[PDB]
Amino acid sequence: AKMRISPELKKLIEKYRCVKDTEGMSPAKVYKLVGENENLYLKMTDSRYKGTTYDVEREKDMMLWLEGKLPVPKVLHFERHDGWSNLLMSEADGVLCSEEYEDEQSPEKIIELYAECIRLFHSIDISDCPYTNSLDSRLAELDYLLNNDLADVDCENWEEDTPFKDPRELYDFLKTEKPEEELVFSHGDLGDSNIFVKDGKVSGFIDLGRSGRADKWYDIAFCVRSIREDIGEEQYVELFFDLLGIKPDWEKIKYYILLDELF
Numbered sequence: 001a002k003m004r005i006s007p008e009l010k011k012l013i014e015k016y017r018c019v020k021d022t023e024g025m026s027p028a029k030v031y032k033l034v035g036e037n038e039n040l041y042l043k044m045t046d047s048r049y050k051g052t053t054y055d056v057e058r059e060k061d062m063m064l065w066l067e068g069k070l071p072v073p074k075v076l077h078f079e080r081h082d083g084w085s086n087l088l089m090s091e092a093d094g095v096l097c098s099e100e101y102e103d104e105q106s107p108e109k110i111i112e113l114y115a116e117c118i119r120l121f122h123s124i125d126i127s128d129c130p131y132t133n134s135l136d137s138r139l140a141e142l143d144y145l146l147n148n149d150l151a152d153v154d155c156e157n158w159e160e161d162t163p164f165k166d167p168r169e170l171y172d173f174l175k176t177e178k179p180e181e182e183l184v185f186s187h188g189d190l191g192d193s194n195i196f197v198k199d200g201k202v203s204g205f206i207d208l209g210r211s212g213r214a215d216k217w218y219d220i221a222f223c224v225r226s227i228r229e230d231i232g233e234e235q236y237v238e239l240f241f242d243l244l245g246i247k248p249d250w251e252k253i254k255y256y257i258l259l260d261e262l263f
């Protein structure tokens, strides 16, 4: 009752015209705040998601920690208000990657960008990284989500051709076939709509609730998935690995792609 945002947060944003973001299918609410001289974004998750990699508070922590390490929005305000975790942030710098480069026209550039994300991430010191997204941690949260009907279990997972017939069957695979983990900085949802570019370089990362320490193959796997889905031609997957300077590990790649299935 009353409000989802505090009186002080409301005071902060009242001069702005709120526009609800439509493209975005997580449990968070995202609002673009249009002001006279700049836009802000306000992102909110409810208490059901506290402690999970959807938790906007966890995203806020990573956003703060990443300042000076990766280009990310500025955290302007955070609060917990009546169950809700609310994050007010600045607008990322540059153009959303999915908007700047289309798959039909700039395949090599897209591959190049993804590759540069991986390289950049590997240079980040994770000594004092706030969160460790080990598989034990991710699996524990997936178990929590499934138990409480909070996972993304619907739609494509009902199709008769699905590799696993129900969520617990997938969960079992993930739980019992964990690969070896060598921890590095991981974005957690590396994709063309969580990344900004400017002057042909990466200029911002957003959607950071799932970022933290994780195995190096995790983000690489997301790149492979994107390349195959958006571009399709396998040549470009091979090119991606040519830029990385490593041979693929299809077992680990398949694993992390399956891990993200229910998120």
Ligand SMILES: NCC[C@H](O)C(=O)N[C@@H]1C[C@H](N)[C@@H](O[C@H]2O[C@H](CN)[C@@H](O)[C@H](O)[C@H]2N)[C@H](O[C@@H]2O[C@H](CO)[C@H](O)[C@H]2O)[C@H]1O
Pocket: 025, 026, 152, 156, 189, 191, 193, 225, 229, 260, 261, 262, 263
């Ligand atoms: N042949 C592949 C099918 C397989 O079921 C699978 O990989 N399925 C995956 C499941 C994955 N969780 C989806 O993620 C997407 O949904 C999440 C929320 N439920 C978002 O938080 C996330 O950022 C977004 N990437 C992904 O969607 C892909 O990302 C695109 C959107 O950004 C597009 O929607 C789709 O390509 C989809 O292909």
Ligand SMILES: Nc1ncnc2c1ncn2[C@@H]1O[C@H](COP(=O)(O)OP(=O)(O)NP(=O)(O)O)[C@@H](O)[C@H]1O
Pocket: 021, 023, 024, 025, 026, 027, 028, 029, 030, 041, 043, 073, 089, 090, 091, 092, 096, 193, 194, 206, 207, 208
């Ligand atoms: N700080 C920002 N600067 C500029 N654009 C933003 C910013 N935050 C969010 N957006 C836009 O809003 C969209 C969704 O924000 P995002 O943080 O990715 O949502 P989400 O709740 O995590 N949903 P999903 O991307 O499906 O997981 C982005 O793709 C951008 O288009």
Ligand SMILES: [Mg+2]
Pocket: 024, 193, 194, 206, 207
């Ligand atoms: Mg996103």
Ligand SMILES: [Mg+2]
Pocket: 026, 189, 207
């Ligand atoms: Mg997200």
